[PDB]
Amino acid sequence: MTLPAFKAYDIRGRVPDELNEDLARRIGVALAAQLDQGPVVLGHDVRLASPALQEALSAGLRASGRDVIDIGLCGTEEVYFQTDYLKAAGGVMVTASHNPMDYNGMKLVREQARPISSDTGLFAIRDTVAADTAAPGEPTASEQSRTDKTAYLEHLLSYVDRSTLKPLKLVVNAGNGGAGLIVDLLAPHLPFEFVRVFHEPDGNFPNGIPNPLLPENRDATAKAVKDNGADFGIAWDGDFDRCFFFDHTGRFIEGYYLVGLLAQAILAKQPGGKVVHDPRLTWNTVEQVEEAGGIPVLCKSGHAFIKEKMRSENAVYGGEMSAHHYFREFAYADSGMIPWLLIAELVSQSGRSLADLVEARMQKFPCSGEINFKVADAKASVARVMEHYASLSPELDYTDGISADFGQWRFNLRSSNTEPLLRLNVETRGDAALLETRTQEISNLLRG
Ligand SMILES: [Mg+2]
Structure with a gap:
């Protein structure tokens, strides 16, 4: 060993x-x-x-x-x-x-x-x-x-046109990690009103581990948004390379939709750029990139793969559905700060709420979210799914796991390499009912 x-x-x-x-x-x-x-x-x-x-x-x-x-x-x-x-x-x-x-x-x-x-x-x-x-x-x-964080702070601010920013009210939840230190250094240079939740760095984590995916952390941010009438809310993990968004209704935004939104925000500044994305959920990203005049580039998920692909393509931006956002100008690396600055600028310039921006895409491309299955034998579970759907002749792609495109719906199925664990993502073209039936169908095949 x-x-x-x-x-x-x-x-x-x-x-x-x-x-x-x-x-x-x-x-x-x-x-x-x-x-x-x-x-x-x-x-x-x-x-x-x-x-x-x-x-x-x-x-x-x-x-x-x-x-x-x-x-x-x-x-x-x-x-x-x-x-x-x-x-x-x-x-x-x-x-x-x-x-x-x-x-x-x-x-x-x-x-x-x-x-x-x-x-x-x-x-x-x-x-x-x-x-x-x-x-x-x-x-x-x-x-x-x-x-001294001056050069880093100046770099962050260069992504937005500060004369176009509105004085939005933003809930920020550092989860007692490190993010609140950066917010406070940026705050003098921005018109936003911040509502600070779990703000002080505290490695004892009196309010729980800084993991915004835990429902108790989710609810703290959502409650703060609703109670304060904030335009949206942001939460980070402890080292804030991941950021998570809540709209003004307190709804937690699935990270898939942020890739397309950030792509269109970026492409408005770098027209014709390439955008790298992963294969788990794709249709919304591809459409939003092409509508904004960019070129989508499919890549294996995982930061090491995304970053190498962005370098070889001179891609301006790459995003994963799991709240990883990479920027060419930021040394081709990921940031949990650039994303929300870009979203605040998009809200400021467009006059649209984050909810309205996201709602339109969710209706067009409903997705299951990522679903995990511990199984006895990954190879047998995958074969059971494939043989079950064979007679529909899906278009298959093996960039990262198995992607099967049926026309009106698609799925991606990836197996963990360490443990027998399968990860499932499903989306459809505007059909929430089909999404639910196919997701439960595959779920059954994967289990007993
Ligand atoms: Mg992290």
Whole structure:
């Protein structure tokens, strides 16, 4: 076996069982051998163990002759931005994003904030770490503290025309993660009225884990929107690389529809651009991109795949239905801040509420949302679905799992690689009844 903390795209584990200061220091040593020359940017989130793990990581890096730029408490996207902006050799964010309190982890990037994944260095780091029995060296390099967020803040504001913004009333819910610090730095430069919920960074998480998909967190944001007559509400996960929207009725907006909306917002500024999207839910995105005069580019889901595809296509924007939004101008990386600035600008300029913008698309392309099935045998469950629908002769595509297009409805079925878990997404052309029947039909086939 191997170190469980090392997953396909990042490091994640329970503290101190699977991730601790010694592993963090050894990761620092091993990372120094994988990067090109240059300093390494380090940041961390609000979790209690995060400063300790980042300092151990810094010690291991500086023991191997790497200068470290410590940007302190931050969101994950700030590590991406500063790594690119400072022309660093790489960057590490210490975070467990949205996971329980006993968890922590790291996201690693190399130059230009390109991801380090299991086949692009991460497992080379793992094997090095797993074989390193040597005694800790002494730091032979400097740590510079650079907590100024000015360039990051200026970059965020460049995406919108501030003279066109209306004074919207916005609920913001940092979930006691790091997002509220950025909101407060942006607030002097914007006309919005903010209603701050769960605002202060607090790694004890007195209001629950910063995971806006949990129904108790959803309800706190929705209630704040309705109680304050806000134009819309925004919630983030702990390291705020994901943002989630609530319209003025308090309705939680399914992330699929935001891809098409952000695409049309962006394409109004960069006409004719390419937009990368994933294959789970597609029809609404394709139509909104083409109507705005852009070119949709299908890609495998997963941030590593999206980012590489955006680079090879010079795509201006890429989005996933699971609340990941990537921007060419932002070093081809994801941000949980750019999306809501663009949406506030779209609401301001159009005179349409977020509800009306979303409602129109939901009626045209109703979707099931992503549905998970633990099964005994993934291959057998998939075969049972395929053979059942064979006589309708769907158009099949295998970009990411199996996509079957029947004309008036389609589905995508992906299998997890670790565990026997199937993920289902269904959508139709304007037919909510068909959506429900086919979704329950497939659900039965997947189960008993
Ligand atoms: Mg996150």
